[PDB]
Amino acid sequence: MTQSLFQPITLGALTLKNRIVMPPMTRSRASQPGDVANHMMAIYYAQRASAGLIVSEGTQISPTAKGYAWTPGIYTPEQIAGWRIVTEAVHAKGCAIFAQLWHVGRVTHPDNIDGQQPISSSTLKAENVKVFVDNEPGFVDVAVPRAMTKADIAQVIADYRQAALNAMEAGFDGIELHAANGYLINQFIDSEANNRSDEYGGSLENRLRFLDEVVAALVDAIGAERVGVRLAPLTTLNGTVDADPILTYTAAAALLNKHRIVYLHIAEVDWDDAPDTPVSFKRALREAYQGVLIYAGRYNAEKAEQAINDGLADMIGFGRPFIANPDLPERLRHGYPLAEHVPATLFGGGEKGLTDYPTYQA
Ligand SMILES: Cc1cc2nc3c(=O)[nH]c(=O)nc-3n(C[C@H](O)[C@H](O)[C@H](O)COP(=O)(O)O)c2cc1C
Ligand SMILES: O=Cc1ccc(O)cc1
Numbered sequence: 001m002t003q004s005l006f007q008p009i010t011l012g013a014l015t016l017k018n019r020i021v022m023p024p025m026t027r028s029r030a031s032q033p034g035d036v037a038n039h040m041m042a043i044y045y046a047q048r049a050s051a052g053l054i055v056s057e058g059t060q061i062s063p064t065a066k067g068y069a070w071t072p073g074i075y076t077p078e079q080i081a082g083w084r085i086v087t088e089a090v091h092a093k094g095c096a097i098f099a100q101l102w103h104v105g106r107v108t109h110p111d112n113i114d115g116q117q118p119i120s121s122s123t124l125k126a127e128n129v130k131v132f133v134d135n136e137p138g139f140v141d142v143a144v145p146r147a148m149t150k151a152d153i154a155q156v157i158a159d160y161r162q163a164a165l166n167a168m169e170a171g172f173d174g175i176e177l178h179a180a181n182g183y184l185i186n187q188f189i190d191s192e193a194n195n196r197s198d199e200y201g202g203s204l205e206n207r208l209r210f211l212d213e214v215v216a217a218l219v220d221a222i223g224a225e226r227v228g229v230r231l232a233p234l235t236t237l238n239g240t241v242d243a244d245p246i247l248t249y250t251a252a253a254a255l256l257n258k259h260r261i262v263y264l265h266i267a268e269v270d271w272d273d274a275p276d277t278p279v280s281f282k283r284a285l286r287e288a289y290q291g292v293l294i295y296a297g298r299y300n301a302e303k304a305e306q307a308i309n310d311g312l313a314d315m316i317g318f319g320r321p322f323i324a325n326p327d328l329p330e331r332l333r334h335g336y337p338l339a340e341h342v343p344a345t346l347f348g349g350g351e352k353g354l355t356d357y358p359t360y361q362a
């Protein structure tokens with residue numbers, strides 16, 4: 001029935017139109033050279049501004065934080081200006097937008113990071129994990145990362161902190177820390193991906209240290225009311241696996257709650273990796289974290305409404321459906337049929353498969 005889904009909600013200093021979120025979705029359409037957010041991306045996001053909140057596709061915080069060809073960066077003056085075009089376009093439509101600050105850690109190839117060697121919590125390679133390269137050739141197997149030294153850690157935190165400032169300069173309403181889907185921070189969090197012997201490995205407290213320090217920096221830079229964090233407790237598609245996900249992530253949620261981050265975003269499904277997410281686990285997260293809770297992963301109107309009314313979620317993200325339906329909210333509200341996206345145009349290319357999905361017309 002969707003009544004709650006269409007109720008507004010306060011997100012820090014923002015008052016959002018509804019509970020629908022356009023989750024972060026890499027489309028790899030950044031202008032070359034320079035990986036700059038561009039005009040077609042601005043049109044793309046503005047077309048979907050009826051969402052209550054838009055979270056931008058992952059945007060790398062540095063040259064070595066990139067994992068896929070043509071993804072937009074947020075560290076150069078040009079990239080900031082490029083993103084500004086996007087946020088202004090989105091704001092002109094009346095919608096809030098957060099920048100997803102990204103660092104892929106070991107999920108990359110030297111070709112995508114100026115020949116450099118990928119960094120990670122440890123020297124563990126992601127099993128059968130491929131990334132894309134060039135400016136095109138194709139997919140290639142990820143490389144072997146090198147364990148991050150204390151200097152590396154201080155640098156990445158620095159890059160995250162500056163990226164946050166750059167996001168504000170770019171006009172974003174806030175930032176989302178990508179600590180999910182097997183990327184850098186996730187590589188510290190999950191036990192089976194972190195084999196460090198120092199303060200950033202071993203115990204649960206140590207495995208959460210990097211997340212704690214990065215968030216501390218982000219909050220210090222732009223305020224907790226403008227900081228969101230994304231986690232992926234149960235999925236493992238990109239190579240990260242935890243030994244006790246339920247405990248690790250309930251703890252992570254409690255930790256983030258202390259930082260008073262504005263929202264916690266849970267990535268429940270990653271492609272066809274949809275692990276059963278116990279309602280009991282969801283209720284524990286609801287108690288561990290008291291802010292705005294967002295979930296994304298195979299939701300339809302019914303399941304979204306039910307998640308909100310059961311007290312499990314405050315907002316719900318719809319990813320793939322938003323790709324093919326710029327007016328997704330209107331369709332969900334009326335029960336109009338949803339167009340399906342074309343996998344072949346998800347990444348790279350131009351406007352085709354990006355801005356030419358029409359709004360609904362009976
Ligand atoms: C083309 C595509 C690119 C994605 N890129 C991102 C991203 O950059 N960052 C992220 O955290 N999740 C990313 N996601 C995951 C989505 O945000 C979302 O959690 C996922 O698609 C599950 O929701 P859905 O079943 O409604 O599509 C991507 C998904 C797709 C389909
Ligand atoms: O096919 C191109 C491509 C670019 C970046 C990716 O993330 C995935 C695919």
Ligand SMILES: O=Cc1ccc(O)cc1
Pocket residue numbers: 026058180181270
């Ligand atoms: O398909 C690209 C992709 C990028 C980042 C993720 O978090 C998940 C998917």
